[PDB]
């Protein structure tokens, strides 16, 4: 479970529940389950907060990876309804946690910030500089390889 | 020895085709054009009250023209060369 | 027309001679149906007129420019008719412009009957007849300017055209002749204008700035080139 | 195998190639990107996965011949533009 | 009233939002300089009357 | 490993003088000397160098002699003069390294474990970078290949000390270009960059031809770094890139136009003033 949150991949709350609910909440003689996620009311509150953490981690992963994901797809991947996912995303956006722009009319959750011409051409120039530099490295090493294999 | 002392400050070939930071070029253009605006005000006042804004204006124009022309030409060369 | 095609007018000439040549060339192109180039040439001639020295030449240039601009379908500047020197001279042309803009062909025929003979003295009668038969181009241009997806039936209704097919013919001809920027979806009969694209994102501003820069550099080269330092 | 200009990948080709469902290509490319072999991005309204590469591979004689032909084309273009630039800018060059 | 930036699309029913591009100070200063040398050209027109 | 080797003008001038001194009478291949300098976090600074009497035979590519005691007491003298200079490598003027150089590099390693040999091609004068710094490495080659000595390349550059800087600037004093650049020199810099890119691409194409024809073995690695070059192409004519490019081109073009207009108005004012002045002089003559 700890290594799961360190991996930059979506974890499905349904699958995570199906694989960890008995081990964490219920437990057994061989698995001394803690009181953190017990059947108590505070246990259920902590369970809801765990689901919130899971969906926040998933949302961060999508923001890292996706650019324009449909709202229904995000709802399916977050194990939430469309309205619940929309409300959670709006809450995250307002608190400046993540950057998103919910195009509600079409159901688009575009993540990338607007690309000004300045930054676009700056990225183009950076790509060109890297290309030239590693071309120079390749030329030097090609000279080395020819030189050794006389 | 003359040429291989010249090799000291000689710019690399990647420097000729490199492009100045576009976000910096715009700020430089803004600054120099605003100075040119103040210079144009001074030049209008001086020429009207005649019957050194001119030199400063000419220097600013030289700077602006060389910077923008070089950046544009480097952009075109980079667009054609790398495809 | 043959000579001006063969001979080349020297650029390094008097602005007065340049203005006269531009006026004559504009008249040539107006008669030769090259209306847009004639309008541009006559506008340049008017711009190069000797400020306020040649009342008659300016009056004739204004008359011809107004006529050709009306032929293009563009309503001219109103100020032309209210100038102290060109008020009475262009007053018949004021009536002509009002008649065509209002779309009242009866007013056009009326002003032809009364003051049209004066056009013969002004050497513009043929152009005025061409405009009498080309008035509808102005209405088509107005419709294109205002609307963006106006149907053919609405165009015929607003242009007094008897049939929608006549409207189709007129709008297609106007589109081909470089007066409109629309296309007629004949499948359901609506005229969709070419959607306006961000010109600053295109190469047009670069070309305009190129012309301006070339002119400025040529001006600097001419000014520095003489410098007239006496011995 | 993409021609390096239309680097975008459609959903159907991935589904038909890896014989997997169209709902699994998304997670598969996500895993590949997470491992560190892809640096692209994922779209959903068009569901075309944008593609950029930082994970090279082994070459072959035919592939080397083709890619050196591409490099020859690149160098020919560079030489042509260099010739044009020096010819047009002869006086200013100094 | 120049509050929150956006335009309503009544045709379908939408209020778009954007980031109000600054103004491009370079172009405004260029316009001011064009006006300034228009004034300078008028001043030169006041000159050049001495042939 | 070493990140960089910054070579001062003094060592390149000294190796030039050494090669001219030897080849003036002793027509011979590469001449060997020792490179001294100061270390840093990881970047070497080569500052002074000296020549060690060396001989070689083209037969068996192993009949050579570089003196040991000569190196030792040249360093003794140099350290007595300046103790900050440490043995940090060696140099030879040969454009290509020989099969022999491995032994000399091991001999230098005996004096400095992280010894880096700098090839200085005194005879050719070309595009640039007349110094190539090479370091011996030893590994199992990771991907299961037979092991050998090999000379891993380390990047090099030409820096200068303030005294050397003023010395070289005064030494040129007749072909030094303006540091402000101006349009002519920026355009020539662009042309030089295009020429250098063409030369590098031509060299890479020749290497690829040698590999494909079998005259050189497929490296199977680094070659895919050249493939990474091939992938890094910006792919211009993309719609967003085209729009941004046009926007910035127009943004620069309007400034160019404004400056050209400013210059034209200034020139017109100057011409008006000159005409007024010459007419004033003509009328005041009478």
UniProtKB/Swiss-Prot annotation, chain B:
Highest taxon of the lineage: Eukaryota
Modified residues (Phosphoserine): 12
Tissue and organ expression note: Widely expressed. Highest levels in heart and skeletal muscle.
UniProt record similarity statement: Belongs to the peptidase M67A family. PSMD14 subfamily.
Known role: Component of the 26S proteasome, a multiprotein complex involved in the ATP-dependent degradation of ubiquitinated proteins. This complex plays a key role in the maintenance of protein homeostasis by removing misfolded or damaged proteins, which could impair cellular functions, and by removing proteins whose functions are no longer required. Therefore, the proteasome participates in numerous cellular processes, including cell cycle progression, apoptosis, or DNA damage repair.
Known partners and oligomeric status: Component of the 19S proteasome regulatory particle complex. The 26S proteasome consists of a 20S core particle (CP) and two 19S regulatory subunits (RP). The regulatory particle is made of a lid composed of 9 subunits including PSMD4, a base containing 6 ATPases and few additional components. Within the complex, PSMD4 interacts with subunit PSMD7 through their respective MPN domain. Interacts with TXNL1.
Protein name: 26S proteasome non-ATPase regulatory subunit 14
Organism from which the protein derives: Homo sapiens (Human)
Higher taxonomy: Eukaryota, Metazoa, Chordata, Craniata, Vertebrata
UniProtKB/Swiss-Prot annotation, chain C:
Positions bearing Phosphoserine: 151, 163
PCI domain: residues covered: 19-198
Source species, domain of life: Eukaryota
Protein task: Component of the 26S proteasome, a multiprotein complex involved in the ATP-dependent degradation of ubiquitinated proteins. This complex plays a key role in the maintenance of protein homeostasis by removing misfolded or damaged proteins, which could impair cellular functions, and by removing proteins whose functions are no longer required. Therefore, the proteasome participates in numerous cellular processes, including cell cycle progression, apoptosis, or DNA damage repair.
Quaternary assembly: Component of the 19S proteasome regulatory particle complex. The 26S proteasome consists of a 20S core particle (CP) and two 19S regulatory subunits (RP). The regulatory particle is made of a lid composed of 9 subunits including PSMD3, a base containing 6 ATPases and few additional components. Interacts with UBQLN1 (via ubiquitin-like domain). Interacts with ERCC6.
Family: Belongs to the proteasome subunit S3 family.
Protein name: 26S proteasome non-ATPase regulatory subunit 3
Organism encoding this protein: Homo sapiens
Gene name tied to this protein: PSMD3
Shown stretch of the complete protein: 268 to 498 of 534
UniProtKB/Swiss-Prot annotation, chain E:
Entry's localization field: Nucleus; Cytoplasm, Cytosol
Post-translational modification: Phosphorylated by AMPK.
Tissue localization of expression: Highly expressed in embryonic stem cells (ESCs). Expression decreases as ESCs differentiate.
Top-level division of the source organism's lineage: Eukaryota
Conditions for induction: By FOXO4; expression in embryonic stem cells (ESCs) is mediated by FOXO4.
Function: Component of the 26S proteasome, a multiprotein complex involved in the ATP-dependent degradation of ubiquitinated proteins. This complex plays a key role in the maintenance of protein homeostasis by removing misfolded or damaged proteins, which could impair cellular functions, and by removing proteins whose functions are no longer required. Therefore, the proteasome participates in numerous cellular processes, including cell cycle progression, apoptosis, or DNA damage repair. In the complex, PSMD11 is required for proteasome assembly.
Family (UniProt): Belongs to the proteasome subunit S9 family.
Subunit structure of this chain's protein: Component of the 19S proteasome regulatory particle complex. The 26S proteasome consists of a 20S core particle (CP) and two 19S regulatory subunits (RP). The regulatory particle is made of a lid composed of 9 subunits including PSMD11, a base containing 6 ATPases and few additional components.
Full protein name: 26S proteasome non-ATPase regulatory subunit 11
Annotated source species: Homo sapiens (Human)
Gene: PSMD11
From Swiss-Prot, chain F:
Superkingdom of the source species: Eukaryota
MPN domain sequence ranges: 5-140
GO cellular component: cytosol; extracellular exosome; extracellular region; ficolin-1-rich granule lumen; membrane; nucleoplasm; nucleus; proteasome complex
Keywords assigned: Acetylation, Isopeptide bond, Proteasome, Ubl conjugation
Covalent cross-link Glycyl lysine isopeptide (Lys-Gly) (interchain with G-Cter in ubiquitin), where: 176
Gene Ontology terms: biological process: proteasome-mediated ubiquitin-dependent protein catabolic process
Single GO MF annotation: protein homodimerization activity
SMART domains: JAB_MPN
UniProt modified residues of type N6-acetyllysine: 200, 210
Annotated family: Belongs to the peptidase M67A family.
Described function: Component of the 26S proteasome, a multiprotein complex involved in the ATP-dependent degradation of ubiquitinated proteins. This complex plays a key role in the maintenance of protein homeostasis by removing misfolded or damaged proteins, which could impair cellular functions, and by removing proteins whose functions are no longer required. Therefore, the proteasome participates in numerous cellular processes, including cell cycle progression, apoptosis, or DNA damage repair.
Note: Does not bind a metal ion.
Protein name as annotated: 26S proteasome non-ATPase regulatory subunit 7
Organism: Homo sapiens
Gene responsible for this protein: PSMD7
């Amino acid at each position: 479970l700890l290594k799961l949150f360190t991996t930059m991949e979506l974890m499905r709350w349904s699958t995570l529940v199906e694989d960890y609910g008995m081990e964490l909440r219920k437990g057994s003689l061989e698995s001394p389950a803690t009181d953190v996620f017990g059947s108590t009311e505070e246990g259920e509150k902590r369970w809801k907060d765990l689901k919130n953490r899971v969906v926040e981690h998933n949302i961060r992963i999508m923001a890292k990876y996706y650019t324009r994901i449909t709202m229904k797809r995000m709802a399916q991947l977050l194990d939430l309804s469309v309205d619940e996912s929309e409300a959670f995303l709006s809450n995250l956006v307002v608190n400046k946690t993540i950057f998103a722009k919910v195009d509600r009319l079409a159901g688009i959750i575009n993540f990338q910030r607007p690309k000004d011409p300045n930054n676009l051409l700056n990225d183009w120039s950076q790509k060109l500089n890297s290309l030239m530099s590693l071309v120079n490295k390749t030329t030097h090493l090609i000279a080395k390889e020819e030189m050794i294999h006389n | 020895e003359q040429k291989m002392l010249l090799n000291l400050h000689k710019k690399s070939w990647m420097e000729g085709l490199t492009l100045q930071d576009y976000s910096e070029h715009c700020k430089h253009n803004e600054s120099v054009v605003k100075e040119m605006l103040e210079l144009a005000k001074n030049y209008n006042k001086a020429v009207e009250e005649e019957d050194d804004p001119k030199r400063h204006l000419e220097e600013h124009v030289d700077v602006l023209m060389t910077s923008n022309i070089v950046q544009c030409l480097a952009a075109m060369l980079d667009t054609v060369v790398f495809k | 027309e043959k000579l001006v095609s063969k001979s080349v007018f020297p650029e390094q000439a008097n602005n007065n001679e340049w203005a006269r040549y531009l006026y004559y060339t504009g008249r040539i192109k107006a008669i030769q149906l090259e209306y847009s180039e004639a309008r541009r040439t006559m506008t340049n001639a008017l711009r190069k007129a000797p400020q306020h020295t040649a009342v008659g030449f300016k009056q004739t240039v204004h008359k011809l420019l107004i006529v050709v601009e009306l032929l293009l379908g563009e309503i001219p500047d109103r100020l032309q008719f209210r100038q102290p020197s060109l008020k009475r001279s262009l007053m018949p042309y004021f009536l002509l412009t009002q008649a065509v803009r209002t779309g009242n062909l009866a007013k056009f025929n009326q002003v032809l009957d009364q003051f049209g003979e004066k056009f013969q003295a002004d050497g513009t009668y043929t152009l005025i007849i061409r405009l009498r038969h080309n008035v509808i181009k102005t209405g088509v241009r107005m419709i294109s300017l205002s609307y963006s997806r106006i149907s053919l039936a609405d165009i015929a209704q607003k242009l007094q055209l008897d049939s929608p097919e006549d409207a189709e013919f007129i709008v297609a001809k106007a589109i081909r002749d470089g007066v409109i920027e629309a296309s007629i979806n004949h499948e359901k009969g609506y005229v969709q204008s070419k959607e306006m694209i961000d010109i600053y994102s295109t190469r047009e501003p670069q070309l305009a700035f190129h012309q301006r820069i070339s002119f400025c550099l040529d001006i600097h080269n001419m000014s520095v080139k003489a410098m007239r330092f006496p011995p | 195998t993409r021609p390096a200009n239309h680097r975008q990948l459609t959903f159907e080709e991935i589904a038909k190639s890896a014989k997997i469902t169209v709902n699994e290509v998304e997670l598969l490319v996500m895993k590949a990107l997470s491992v560190g072999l892809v640096k692209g991005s994922i779209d959903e309204v068009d569901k075309r996965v944008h593609m950029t590469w930082v994970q090279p591979r082994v070459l072959d004689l035919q592939q080397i011949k083709g890619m050196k032909d591409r490099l020859e084309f690149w160098c020919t273009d560079v030489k042509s533009m260099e010739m044009l630039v020096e010819h047009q800018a002869h006086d200013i060059l100094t | 009233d120049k509050k929150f930036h956006g335009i309503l699309d009544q045709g379908e029913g939408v209020l778009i939002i954007f980031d109000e591009p600054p103004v491009d100070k370079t172009y405004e200063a260029a316009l001011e300089t064009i006006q300034n040398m228009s004034k300078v050209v008028d001043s030169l027109y006041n000159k050049a009357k001495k042939l | 490993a070493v990140q960089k080797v910054v070579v001062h003008p003094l060592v390149l001038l000294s190796v030039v003088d050494h090669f001219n001194r030897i080849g003036k009478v002793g027509n011979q291949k590469r001449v060997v000397g020792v490179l001294l300098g100061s270390w840093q976090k990881k970047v070497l600074d080569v500052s002074n160098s000296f020549a060690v009497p060396f001989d070689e035979d083209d037969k068996d590519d192993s009949v050579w002699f570089l003196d040991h005691d000569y190196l030792e007491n040249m360093y003794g003298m140099f350290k007595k003069v300046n103790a900050r200079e440490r043995i940090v490598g060696w140099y030879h003027t040969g454009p290509k390294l020989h099969k022999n150089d491995i032994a000399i590099n091991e001999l230098m390693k005996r004096y400095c474990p992280n010894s880096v040999l700098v090839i200085i091609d005194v005879k050719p004068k070309d595009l640039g970078l007349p110094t190539e710094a090479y370091i011996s490495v030893e590994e199992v080659h990771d991907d299961g290949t037979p092991t050998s000595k090999t000379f891993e390349h380390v990047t090099s550059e030409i820096g200068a000390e303030e005294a050397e800087e003023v010395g070289v600037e005064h030494l040129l004093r007749d072909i030094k270009d303006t540091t402000v650049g101006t349009l002519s020199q920026r355009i020539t810099n662009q042309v030089h960059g295009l020429k250098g890119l063409n030369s590098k691409l031509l060299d890479i194409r020749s290497y690829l031809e040698k590999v494909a024809t079998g005259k050189l073995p497929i490296n199977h690695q680094i070659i895919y770094q050249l493939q990474d070059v091939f992938n890094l192409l910006p792919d211009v004519s993309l719609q967003e890139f085209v729009k941004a490019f046009y926007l910035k081109t127009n943004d620069q073009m309007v400034v160019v136009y404004l400056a050209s207009l400013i210059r034209s108005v200034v020139a017109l004012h100057n011409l008006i003033n000159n005409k007024i002045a010459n007419r004033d002089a003509e009328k005041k003559e009478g």
